[PDB]
Design a protein that fits this description.
Chain lengths: ~260, ~250
């Protein structure tokens, strides 16, 4: 049967290129939590697949002037991919246009920053400008701020938008580098913060979770794979396989 | 006017309770709690009216291993005796095979409720002994997790619970709490509910961490068009901060 086209994006420890001296080809190039998830889905549901990195390098957001989506979300809308297997947040605006499986991981937006400071919350960032802050451009965190009616988050969006050329970044890796090299706090998903802080002992999460969301496998609207993948996820959960996969990929610091 | 939706639910504090009052209350006005607030928001957002009915058999729902039939709220949905189940109803593999669920409105996991002052630190410590009894709600998701599990510690625990089921499987979380308070018994309980109970009784504690991860969702019969509509409403409520506000209201040692 036809191999499913799977769109994804590079994001440690979910999706990475394998390190090797020999060139690698096709699906053999990739590893990570989401790649292990994809393999399990493929065995349980009985499909073959071809992994393709999203052409525009984006997760996906809607253009405020012309209304078009980009990123992996757009690839699904346009039926250029069968599945998006990635750390792809399930959100209201996305669920209006694509389908998602139920979540394989739960998380929330939080703050990555340096240690040893009096900053304890989003409110503390919002009320000042000396410490800059931002998010990945055209992802779910950005969109949460852009849409929020909550006073603190609306104030933060106004700042991000004003300073966007500097404070909105194209990847989590770029955001981490800004935290490490400038007076900057990065609004980042908590799952990824846990990974980063385990490996960067001078960085920490600031405050708690700002929201609650899950990552799900994306499908075009109406796809029969959506509910089948939900069932496989729920079975993998029940068996303890997702927890084992998280422990494998998240693997510390003195304290 | 459109037919009012029949909403099955179950009494479970602080999700669904009878309001305290001296005058008798009628109809929907009888009920309050997190899930009642959720239902009200869903009805306003999706434009339906409803009638709340407590599940007739008093159960969440499990499948009988001999005759293959479901019970509880799950069975009421299968049989189209209710349009929705709005309750702390766990989304599970075996249930999703036979009913549909919205995406989760709250996440949780199984954990352990026990009295303070103990060296017992985990499910492994419980499984290795028999002086302290342990159990779960009969015909709910926790019981089913143990009954199905192939993980050595949990399979051992199920063998004990099954052997002693007339004593250690209980009919409600409230009965489980009373057993913890009145005997040497540890209760396998969902974490959200433990959080509520331990804030109210400072002699009790959670033991260990979460054994699994799951969500509560609104149940619908398989194929229902309300499922995806309710998912969207829940995602919008999330994004506005209303679910966290509802949790703070009802969970407010
Ligand atoms: N996981 C996000 C990207 C990262 C972020 O927005 O923080 C998404 O699905 O858009
Ligand atoms: N919330 C559970 C009942 C309680 C439990 O099993 O711990 C259910 O949906 O079955
Ligand atoms: Cl798991
Ligand atoms: Cl769903
Ligand atoms: Na990337
Ligand atoms: Na959708
Ligand atoms: Na289902
Ligand atoms: Na004791």
């Amino acid at each position: 049967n036809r191999s499913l086209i799977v769109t994804t994006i590079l994001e440690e420890p979910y999706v990475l290129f394998k390190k090797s001296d020999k060139p690698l080809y096709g699906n053999d190039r990739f590893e990570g939590y989401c790649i292990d998830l994809l393999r399990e889905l493929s065995t349980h549901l009985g499909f073959t697949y071809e992994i393709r990195l999203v052409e525009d390098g984006k997760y996906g957001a809607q253009d405020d002037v012309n209304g078009q989506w980009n990123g992996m979300v757009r690839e699904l809308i346009d039926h250029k991919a069968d599945l998006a297997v990635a750390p792809l947040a399930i959100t209201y605006v996305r669920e209006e246009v694509i389908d998602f499986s139920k979540p394989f991981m739960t998380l929330g937006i939080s703050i990555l920053y340096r240690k040893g400071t009096p900053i304890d919350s989003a409110d503390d960032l919002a009320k000042q400008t000396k410490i800059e802050y931002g998010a990945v451009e055209d992802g779910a965190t950005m969109t949460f701020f852009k849409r929020s009616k909550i006073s603190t988050y609306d104030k933060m969006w106004a700042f991000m938008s004003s300073r966007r050329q500097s404070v909105l970044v194209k990847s989590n890796e770029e955001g981490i580098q800004r935290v490490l090299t400038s007076d900057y706090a990065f609004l980042m998903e908590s799952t990824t913060i846990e990974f980063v802080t385990q490996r960067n002992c001078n960085l920490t999460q600031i405050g708690g979770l700002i929201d609650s969301k899950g990552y799900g496998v994306g499908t075009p609207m109406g796809s029969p794979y959506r509910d089948k993948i939900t069932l496989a996820i729920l079975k993998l959960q029940e068996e303890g396989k997702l927890h084992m996969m998280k422990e494998k990929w998240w693997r510390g610091c003195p304290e």
